[PDB]
Amino acid sequence: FSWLVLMIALPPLVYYLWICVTYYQGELVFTSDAAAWRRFWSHVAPPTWHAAGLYAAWFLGQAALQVWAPGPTVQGMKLPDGSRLDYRMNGIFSFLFTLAVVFGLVTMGWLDATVLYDQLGPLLTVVNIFTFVFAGFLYFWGPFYDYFMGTALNPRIGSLDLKLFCEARPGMIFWLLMNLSMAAKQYELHGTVTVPMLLVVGFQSFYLIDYFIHEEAVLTTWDIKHEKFGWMLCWGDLVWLPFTYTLQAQYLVHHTHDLPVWGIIAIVALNLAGYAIFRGANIQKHHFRRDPNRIVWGKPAKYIKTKQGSLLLTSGWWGIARHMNYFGDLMIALSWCLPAAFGSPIPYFHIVYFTILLLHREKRDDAMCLAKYGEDWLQYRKKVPWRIVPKIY
């Protein structure tokens, strides 16, 4: 019921926003006018052979890389059953490689610095069709909406795991490439790469670089550990992420304003405070959980020794709130959106979205650790009451 309608509803929302930002001036268009709606929705681009070819070439370039990237191999999760999946993983080498190759096609003139901006509209629809055909196949490898949530758990061909792959290669690297192309397009249309583009493009670049340095970490996440793929997962990978995360740069492509240096200082500080907290918390959890006795913020570490053989840090960021890290991530989000300034609501629809996401994620994780840690978790929730913020929530 809600799922098939949500399923048909999603691709339009991406078109809507894209149309909005590119063809209008990033204003939230809404009228009741018939003629206005025909003008609005005519802007949807049909699927071109050069686009389908280009994407298919890219997606298979990444699949190729994912399969023959140098190494190492890691064991994956799922302690019971065993039920321990092999993961060849070369995200770093892959990333560097596809950069060198892509920039290489670009200097060789064989590809244009701006293809991803130019042939964008058709890509959106090409990938939209490709994910539907794809989700059809994912349904076929393994009862009305199962298209939505999928079957066969973590499906593979030739040591290629699809949830992880789509999570990473053809989805997220495309994100940075688009950003670069859109940077390039701002320069071709206006003579300089404006500072807000450099903030946005650099910030997302570094976030991604950070992501791959911690490629192993995403082997423990809900997407990977628990939820079994499906159209929403696959489409969230190939479509939602690149074509909405690039909205800031999209917007900026024809918004060549600069920011006052105080805005520069506050935005960057926001981003780095956010990274101190997001990466800080995780490292701290780890470095504590490999040596409890070690100091954490000077003081000897305060932990709760859970009956089911695990330790819960009750100090450092984990002492301040149960999810400082999520807060870190959210600061980071807001720091991407603020270069865009206050011309339009569109660039900021990420922090709204991310916020809701984090809220959902928090609730889930909370439940999970109650199912696992029982009273010790409750004891913990007694020690550290604040979910994220933490004086507020």
Side-chain angles (χ1 to χ4, degrees):
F1 294 126
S2 301
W3 290 260
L4 312 181
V5 299
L6 186 81
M7 202 195 50
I8 71 102
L10 282 139
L13 185 69
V14 181
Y15 287 119
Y16 167 92
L17 303 169
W18 163 64
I19 282 179
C20 254
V21 54
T22 41
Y23 291 52
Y24 297 76
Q25 310 143 11
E27 301 191 26
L28 264 209
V29 176
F30 186 91
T31 44
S32 313
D33 213 323
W37 278 127
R38 318 141 67 185
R39 175 174 310 119
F40 189 85
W41 290 102
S42 82
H43 299 302
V44 168
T48 80
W49 288 103
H50 295 72
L54 183 38
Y55 187 78
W58 159 250
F59 180 94
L60 292 181
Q62 296 303 124
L65 272 168
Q66 169 76 57
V67 163
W68 297 291
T73 294
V74 189
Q75 328 295 6
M77 261 333 290
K78 271 132 219 222
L79 212 173
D81 199 65
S83 179
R84 192 162 281 284
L85 188 147
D86 252 351
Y87 283 100
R88 157 103 132 193
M89 59 166 48
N90 233 136
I92 291 306
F93 170 103
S94 272
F95 171 67
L96 300 179
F97 191 77
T98 123
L99 240 35
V101 184
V102 143
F103 190 104
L105 265 24
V106 167
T107 32
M108 290 217 314
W110 287 20
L111 212 64
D112 318 350
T114 53
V115 189
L116 295 179
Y117 180 95
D118 297 339
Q119 283 211 68
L120 192 147
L123 291 177
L124 213 188
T125 310
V126 164
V127 184
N128 259 313
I129 298 191
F130 170 61
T131 78
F132 277 95
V133 182
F134 201 12
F137 289 153
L138 295 177
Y139 188 76
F140 296 97
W141 237 146
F144 278 172
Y145 87 128
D146 299 0
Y147 191 88
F148 216 97
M149 314 280 307
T151 171
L153 220 204
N154 45 5
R156 294 183 181 277
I157 319 156
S159 68
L160 160 59
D161 185 34
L162 286 27
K163 315 164 69 159
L164 198 279
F165 173 69
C166 302
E167 182 85 32
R169 310 302 171 70
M172 242 162 186
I173 308 207
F174 194 71
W175 169 22
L176 184 47
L177 291 173
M178 280 186 61
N179 273 329
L180 291 187
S181 180
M182 282 172 309
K185 234 269 148 51
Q186 180 188 61
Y187 174 77
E188 144 197 350
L189 298 174
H190 305 99
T192 184
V193 274
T194 83
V195 134
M197 191 78 117
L198 302 166
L199 294 193
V200 164
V201 70
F203 275 169
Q204 299 184 316
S205 298
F206 171 97
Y207 176 102
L208 180 43
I209 297 156
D210 183 76
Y211 182 98
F212 280 133
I213 283 172
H214 300 58
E215 173 188 3
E216 70 255 69
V218 316
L219 278 185
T220 81
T221 180
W222 189 53
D223 287 11
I224 299 282
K225 281 219 285 182
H226 297 102
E227 218 159 32
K228 307 190 174 77
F229 225 161
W231 176 86
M232 197 205 196
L233 246 320
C234 183
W235 182 91
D237 283 335
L238 308 184
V239 177
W240 177 261
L241 172 99
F243 303 95
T244 77
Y245 289 41
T246 40
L247 242 37
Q248 356 293 315
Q250 253 154 308
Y251 185 93
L252 287 182
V253 148
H254 214 57
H255 281 68
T256 69
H257 70 300
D258 280 285
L259 321 329
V261 327
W262 74 263
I264 293 173
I265 296 154
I267 285 179
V268 177
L270 178 61
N271 173 275
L272 303 168
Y275 186 86
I277 287 167
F278 170 76
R279 179 53 63 213
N282 272 117
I283 303 271
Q284 213 178 86
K285 180 172 88 191
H286 290 349
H287 293 339
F288 151 79
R289 267 175 163 195
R290 287 208 183 205
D291 262 304
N293 289 337
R294 282 188 184 174
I295 26 74
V296 164
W297 293 1
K299 227 225 180 79
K302 289 182 177 45
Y303 51 172
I304 297 169
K305 201 177 309 156
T306 82
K307 307 187 180 182
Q308 278 186 344
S310 301
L311 297 160
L312 302 187
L313 195 61
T314 325
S315 65
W317 299 115
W318 306 92
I320 306 299
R322 285 193 253 112
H323 273 311
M324 277 314 296
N325 56 334
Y326 288 172
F327 186 48
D329 224 338
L330 168 58
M331 281 156 72
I332 288 185
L334 193 51
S335 88
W336 303 347
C337 311
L338 289 162
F342 314 96
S344 162
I346 301 260
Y348 298 106
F349 276 155
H350 192 254
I351 65 101
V352 174
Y353 149 66
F354 208 63
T355 289
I356 311 279
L357 184 75
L358 290 173
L359 282 177
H360 176 57
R361 219 154 149 190
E362 186 274 336
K363 84 161 191 174
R364 189 184 56 255
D365 172 38
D366 198 302
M368 219 50 209
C369 290
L370 196 52
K372 224 199 75 162
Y373 289 121
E375 202 72 40
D376 298 307
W377 196 241
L378 191 32
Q379 222 299 335
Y380 182 55
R381 268 152 45 153
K382 297 170 180 154
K383 299 281 189 197
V384 197
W386 301 104
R387 313 180 178 272
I388 303 158
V389 201
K391 290 273 189 187
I392 290 90
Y393 166 94

